[PDB]
Amino acid sequence: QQINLEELMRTGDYAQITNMLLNNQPVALVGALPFITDSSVISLVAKLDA
Amino acid sequence: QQFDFRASMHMLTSNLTFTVYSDLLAFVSADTVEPINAVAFDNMRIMNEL
């Protein structure tokens, strides 16, 4: 699924996201975003990204 | 009146351990969108002459 971030921080977030995050459900996000590069594989196995 | 124990001895029904709260509300966490983004029953946008 999806959820425009632009409209999010505008609308004020209706815990829609808050709920999905809490409950763990496959989802996507959209808009401008800060990436962050890592290396030491480790990080991955440890699944830091979650 | 004479005194008769038996009849003066009553048992007691009392609840146990409350915690009384006043004011209430307070427990409410609430923020606000940025003014530039309002809306009435309208839903188009209150104050919309950019």
Side-chain angles (χ1 to χ4, degrees), chain A residues 10-11, chain B residues 33 37:
Chain A
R10 186 195 83 180
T11 192
Chain B
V33 189
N37 294 299

Side-chain angles (χ1 to χ4, degrees), chain A residues 1 5-6 10 12-13 15 23 25 34 36 41 48-49:
Chain A
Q1 289 159 289
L5 303 178
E6 190 190 300
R10 186 195 83 180
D13 151 42
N23 252 304
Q25 297 192 63
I36 190 170
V41 44
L48 284 182
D49 47 312

